[PDB]
Amino acid sequence: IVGGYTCGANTVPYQVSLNSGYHFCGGSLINSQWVVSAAHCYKSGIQVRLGEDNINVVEGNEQFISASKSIVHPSYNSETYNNDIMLIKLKSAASLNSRVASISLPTSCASAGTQCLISGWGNTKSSGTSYPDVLKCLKAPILSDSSCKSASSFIITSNMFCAGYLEGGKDACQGDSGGPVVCSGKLQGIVSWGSGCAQKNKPGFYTKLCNYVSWIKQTIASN
Ligand SMILES: CC(=N)N1CCC(Oc2cc(C(=O)O)c3cc(C(C)C)n(Cc4ccc5ccc(C(=N)N)cc5c4)c3c2)CC1
Numbered sequence: 001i002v003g004g005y006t007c008g009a010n011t012v013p014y015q016v017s018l019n020s021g022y023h024f025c026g027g028s029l030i031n032s033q034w035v036v037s038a039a040h041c042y043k044s045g046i047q048v049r050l051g052e053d054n055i056n057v058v059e060g061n062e063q064f065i066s067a068s069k070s071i072v073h074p075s076y077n078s079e080t081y082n083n084d085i086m087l088i089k090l091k092s093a094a095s096l097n098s099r100v101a102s103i104s105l106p107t108s109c110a111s112a113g114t115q116c117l118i119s120g121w122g123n124t125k126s127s128g129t130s131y132p133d134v135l136k137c138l139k140a141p142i143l144s145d146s147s148c149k150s151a152s153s154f155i156i157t158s159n160m161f162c163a164g165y166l167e168g169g170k171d172a173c174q175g176d177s178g179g180p181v182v183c184s185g186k187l188q189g190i191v192s193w194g195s196g197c198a199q200k201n202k203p204g205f206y207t208k209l210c211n212y213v214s215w216i217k218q219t220i221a222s223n
Protein backbone atom coordinates (compact mmCIF):
# COMPACT_ATOMS: atom_id res chain seq x y z
CA ILE A 1 0.00 0.00 0.00
CA VAL A 2 1.55 3.28 -1.16
CA GLY A 3 0.39 6.53 0.50
CA GLY A 4 -1.84 4.79 3.03
CA TYR A 5 -1.87 4.64 6.83
CA THR A 6 -1.32 2.14 9.62
CA CYS A 7 -4.60 0.30 10.04
CA GLY A 8 -4.18 -0.50 13.72
CA ALA A 9 -3.88 -4.05 15.09
CA ASN A 10 -6.75 -6.37 14.09
CA THR A 11 -8.94 -3.52 12.82
CA VAL A 12 -9.30 -5.45 9.53
CA PRO A 13 -10.22 -8.80 11.06
CA TYR A 14 -11.02 -10.56 7.73
CA GLN A 15 -7.55 -9.73 6.29
CA VAL A 16 -5.27 -12.76 5.97
CA SER A 17 -1.61 -13.20 5.10
CA LEU A 18 -0.74 -16.18 2.83
CA ASN A 19 2.63 -17.54 3.92
CA SER A 20 5.01 -19.91 2.14
CA GLY A 21 8.02 -19.36 4.42
CA TYR A 22 7.35 -15.61 4.08
CA HIS A 23 4.30 -13.39 3.40
CA PHE A 24 3.56 -13.45 -0.36
CA CYS A 25 -0.08 -12.44 -0.77
CA GLY A 26 -3.18 -11.27 1.02
CA GLY A 27 -6.64 -12.87 1.20
CA SER A 28 -10.05 -12.36 2.80
CA LEU A 29 -11.73 -14.70 5.24
CA ILE A 30 -15.31 -15.38 4.02
CA ASN A 31 -16.34 -18.02 6.54
CA SER A 32 -14.69 -20.13 9.22
CA GLN A 33 -13.26 -22.50 6.55
CA TRP A 34 -12.66 -20.49 3.34
CA VAL A 35 -10.48 -17.64 2.16
CA VAL A 36 -10.78 -15.81 -1.14
CA SER A 37 -7.60 -14.52 -2.81
CA ALA A 38 -6.24 -13.81 -6.31
CA ALA A 39 -5.58 -16.62 -8.82
CA HIS A 40 -2.20 -15.03 -9.52
CA CYS A 41 -1.40 -15.82 -5.85
CA TYR A 42 -1.69 -19.56 -6.55
CA LYS A 43 1.19 -21.76 -5.33
CA SER A 44 1.49 -24.94 -3.29
CA GLY A 45 2.60 -25.04 0.35
CA ILE A 46 0.23 -22.28 1.58
CA GLN A 47 -0.29 -21.54 5.26
CA VAL A 48 -3.09 -19.08 6.00
CA ARG A 49 -2.29 -16.63 8.83
CA LEU A 50 -5.27 -15.02 10.50
CA GLY A 51 -5.30 -12.46 13.27
CA GLU A 52 -2.09 -10.82 12.04
CA ASP A 53 -0.86 -7.33 12.55
CA ASN A 54 2.95 -7.50 12.69
CA ILE A 55 3.76 -10.39 10.34
CA ASN A 56 7.28 -10.78 11.86
CA VAL A 57 6.25 -10.96 15.55
CA VAL A 58 3.96 -13.38 17.34
CA GLU A 59 1.69 -10.89 19.15
CA GLY A 60 -0.84 -13.36 20.52
CA ASN A 61 -3.96 -13.17 18.33
CA GLU A 62 -2.78 -15.20 15.36
CA GLN A 63 -4.23 -18.39 13.99
CA PHE A 64 -1.98 -20.35 11.61
CA ILE A 65 -3.87 -22.92 9.51
CA SER A 66 -2.65 -24.87 6.47
CA ALA A 67 -4.68 -24.94 3.24
CA SER A 68 -6.32 -28.31 2.41
CA LYS A 69 -7.34 -27.30 -1.14
CA SER A 70 -6.91 -24.42 -3.53
CA ILE A 71 -9.32 -23.77 -6.39
CA VAL A 72 -8.28 -21.28 -9.08
CA HIS A 73 -11.30 -19.96 -11.07
CA PRO A 74 -12.03 -22.35 -14.00
CA SER A 75 -11.61 -19.44 -16.44
CA TYR A 76 -8.59 -17.66 -14.97
CA ASN A 77 -6.45 -16.23 -17.78
CA SER A 78 -2.88 -15.56 -16.61
CA GLU A 79 -2.10 -13.42 -19.72
CA THR A 80 -5.02 -10.95 -19.34
CA TYR A 81 -5.72 -11.45 -15.67
CA ASN A 82 -9.42 -12.05 -16.45
CA ASN A 83 -11.12 -13.99 -13.60
CA ASP A 84 -8.27 -13.36 -11.11
CA ILE A 85 -9.85 -15.16 -8.17
CA MET A 86 -9.08 -18.29 -6.15
CA LEU A 87 -10.67 -20.03 -3.17
CA ILE A 88 -8.62 -21.63 -0.42
CA LYS A 89 -10.09 -24.15 2.02
CA LEU A 90 -8.53 -24.35 5.51
CA LYS A 91 -7.55 -27.73 6.99
CA SER A 92 -9.52 -26.78 10.09
CA ALA A 93 -12.11 -24.14 10.92
CA ALA A 94 -10.86 -20.81 12.24
CA SER A 95 -12.19 -19.60 15.58
CA LEU A 96 -14.18 -16.44 15.00
CA ASN A 97 -14.07 -13.56 17.62
CA SER A 98 -13.44 -9.70 17.33
CA ARG A 99 -9.92 -10.04 15.90
CA VAL A 100 -10.68 -12.85 13.40
CA ALA A 101 -13.94 -12.37 11.48
CA SER A 102 -15.41 -13.12 8.10
CA ILE A 103 -16.36 -10.38 5.64
CA SER A 104 -19.80 -10.42 3.95
CA LEU A 105 -20.11 -11.15 0.21
CA PRO A 106 -22.02 -8.50 -1.83
CA THR A 107 -25.59 -8.90 -3.07
CA SER A 108 -25.09 -6.02 -5.52
CA CYS A 109 -22.06 -4.42 -7.15
CA ALA A 110 -20.49 -1.17 -5.91
CA SER A 111 -20.78 2.15 -7.77
CA ALA A 112 -18.13 4.54 -9.08
CA GLY A 113 -17.28 7.23 -6.50
CA THR A 114 -17.71 4.98 -3.42
CA GLN A 115 -14.66 5.09 -1.09
CA CYS A 116 -13.55 1.55 -0.26
CA LEU A 117 -10.95 0.19 2.18
CA ILE A 118 -7.94 -1.58 0.63
CA SER A 119 -5.39 -3.27 2.91
CA GLY A 120 -2.19 -5.28 2.82
CA TRP A 121 1.49 -5.79 3.66
CA GLY A 122 2.68 -4.85 0.17
CA ASN A 123 5.37 -2.37 -0.95
CA THR A 124 4.84 1.16 0.41
CA LYS A 125 6.99 2.94 -2.21
CA SER A 126 6.18 3.96 -5.80
CA SER A 127 9.79 4.07 -6.97
CA GLY A 128 11.82 2.30 -4.29
CA THR A 129 11.10 -0.84 -2.32
CA SER A 130 10.04 -0.89 1.36
CA TYR A 131 7.91 -3.61 2.96
CA PRO A 132 6.03 -2.94 6.19
CA ASP A 133 5.67 -5.27 9.11
CA VAL A 134 2.23 -4.02 10.21
CA LEU A 135 -0.97 -3.91 8.14
CA LYS A 136 -1.45 -0.79 6.01
CA CYS A 137 -4.77 0.64 4.85
CA LEU A 138 -5.92 2.99 2.07
CA LYS A 139 -9.24 4.58 1.23
CA ALA A 140 -9.73 4.83 -2.50
CA PRO A 141 -12.71 5.56 -4.79
CA ILE A 142 -13.95 3.21 -7.49
CA LEU A 143 -13.44 4.93 -10.85
CA SER A 144 -15.83 4.69 -13.79
CA ASP A 145 -15.11 1.87 -16.25
CA SER A 146 -14.66 4.54 -18.96
CA SER A 147 -12.01 6.38 -16.88
CA CYS A 148 -10.21 3.15 -16.21
CA LYS A 149 -10.16 2.27 -19.94
CA SER A 150 -9.02 5.74 -20.94
CA ALA A 151 -5.94 5.42 -18.72
CA SER A 152 -4.62 1.94 -19.54
CA SER A 153 -3.02 0.26 -22.57
CA PHE A 154 -3.84 -3.22 -21.20
CA ILE A 155 -6.92 -5.43 -21.41
CA ILE A 156 -9.78 -4.51 -19.08
CA THR A 157 -12.77 -6.80 -18.81
CA SER A 158 -16.22 -6.58 -17.18
CA ASN A 159 -14.72 -8.74 -14.41
CA MET A 160 -12.35 -5.93 -13.35
CA PHE A 161 -12.79 -2.51 -11.83
CA CYS A 162 -10.20 0.13 -11.12
CA ALA A 163 -9.93 2.33 -8.05
CA GLY A 164 -7.54 4.95 -6.83
CA TYR A 165 -6.06 8.30 -7.81
CA LEU A 166 -5.16 9.18 -11.38
CA GLU A 167 -2.75 11.87 -10.13
CA GLY A 168 -0.68 9.09 -8.51
CA GLY A 169 0.66 8.77 -4.97
CA LYS A 170 -1.91 6.40 -3.43
CA ASP A 171 -2.46 2.78 -4.55
CA ALA A 172 -2.12 -0.87 -3.67
CA CYS A 173 1.12 -2.58 -4.77
CA GLN A 174 3.11 -5.81 -5.14
CA GLY A 175 2.59 -7.93 -1.98
CA ASP A 176 -0.96 -6.58 -1.57
CA SER A 177 -2.08 -9.06 -4.29
CA GLY A 178 -5.07 -11.21 -3.31
CA GLY A 179 -6.12 -8.81 -0.56
CA PRO A 180 -9.50 -7.12 0.10
CA VAL A 181 -11.32 -4.09 -1.23
CA VAL A 182 -14.26 -3.53 1.11
CA CYS A 183 -17.03 -1.06 0.35
CA SER A 184 -19.95 -0.38 2.74
CA GLY A 185 -19.20 -3.57 4.66
CA LYS A 186 -19.08 -5.88 1.59
CA LEU A 187 -16.10 -7.54 -0.06
CA GLN A 188 -16.27 -6.01 -3.56
CA GLY A 189 -12.70 -6.50 -4.81
CA ILE A 190 -9.45 -8.46 -4.85
CA VAL A 191 -6.10 -6.73 -5.43
CA SER A 192 -5.26 -7.95 -8.96
CA TRP A 193 -2.92 -5.77 -11.02
CA GLY A 194 -1.44 -2.43 -11.91
CA SER A 195 1.23 -0.80 -14.07
CA GLY A 196 3.74 -0.07 -11.32
CA CYS A 197 2.19 1.47 -8.20
CA ALA A 198 0.83 4.92 -7.47
CA GLN A 199 1.98 6.22 -10.88
CA LYS A 200 0.10 8.93 -12.76
CA ASN A 201 -2.71 7.55 -14.95
CA LYS A 202 -2.01 4.01 -13.86
CA PRO A 203 -4.67 3.19 -11.21
CA GLY A 204 -5.03 -0.11 -9.34
CA PHE A 205 -7.11 -2.90 -10.91
CA TYR A 206 -9.25 -5.26 -8.88
CA THR A 207 -11.23 -8.44 -9.49
CA LYS A 208 -14.91 -7.48 -9.53
CA LEU A 209 -16.09 -9.91 -6.83
CA CYS A 210 -19.82 -9.26 -7.25
CA ASN A 211 -19.62 -11.18 -10.57
CA TYR A 212 -18.46 -14.32 -8.73
CA VAL A 213 -20.82 -14.76 -5.79
CA SER A 214 -22.74 -17.69 -7.40
CA TRP A 215 -19.44 -19.46 -8.21
CA ILE A 216 -18.14 -18.81 -4.68
CA LYS A 217 -21.33 -20.07 -2.99
CA GLN A 218 -21.71 -23.26 -5.12
CA THR A 219 -17.99 -24.08 -4.84
CA ILE A 220 -18.10 -23.81 -1.04
CA ALA A 221 -21.38 -25.79 -0.87
CA SER A 222 -19.86 -28.74 -2.79
CA ASN A 223 -16.37 -28.81 -1.26
C1 LIG B 1 -2.76 -6.06 -17.31
C2 LIG B 1 -1.51 -6.59 -17.94
N1 LIG B 1 -1.62 -7.70 -18.70
N2 LIG B 1 -0.31 -5.87 -17.83
C3 LIG B 1 0.94 -6.40 -18.42
C4 LIG B 1 1.89 -6.70 -17.25
C5 LIG B 1 2.03 -5.48 -16.30
O1 LIG B 1 2.79 -5.95 -15.17
C6 LIG B 1 3.54 -5.06 -14.43
C7 LIG B 1 4.03 -3.84 -14.90
C8 LIG B 1 4.81 -3.03 -14.07
C9 LIG B 1 5.33 -1.69 -14.59
O2 LIG B 1 6.36 -1.23 -14.08
O3 LIG B 1 4.65 -1.10 -15.48
C10 LIG B 1 5.06 -3.47 -12.76
C11 LIG B 1 5.85 -2.84 -11.63
C12 LIG B 1 5.69 -3.91 -10.57
C13 LIG B 1 6.34 -3.88 -9.19
C14 LIG B 1 7.86 -3.63 -9.34
C15 LIG B 1 5.68 -2.83 -8.34
N3 LIG B 1 4.93 -4.90 -11.02
C16 LIG B 1 4.49 -6.09 -10.25
C17 LIG B 1 3.11 -5.86 -9.56
C18 LIG B 1 2.51 -6.93 -8.88
C19 LIG B 1 1.28 -6.78 -8.23
C20 LIG B 1 0.63 -5.56 -8.25
C21 LIG B 1 -0.62 -5.39 -7.61
C22 LIG B 1 -1.26 -4.17 -7.56
C23 LIG B 1 -0.72 -3.04 -8.20
C24 LIG B 1 -1.37 -1.79 -8.14
N4 LIG B 1 -0.76 -0.73 -8.73
N5 LIG B 1 -2.57 -1.61 -7.58
C25 LIG B 1 0.59 -3.14 -8.95
C26 LIG B 1 1.20 -4.49 -8.93
C27 LIG B 1 2.45 -4.62 -9.56
C28 LIG B 1 4.55 -4.68 -12.29
C29 LIG B 1 3.80 -5.47 -13.14
C30 LIG B 1 0.68 -4.95 -15.80
C31 LIG B 1 -0.20 -4.62 -17.01
Ligand SMILES: [Ca+2]
Nearest residue numbers: 054057058059
Ligand atom coordinates in the same frame (compact mmCIF):
# COMPACT_ATOMS: atom_id res chain seq x y z
CA1 LIG C 1 2.14 -11.56 14.10
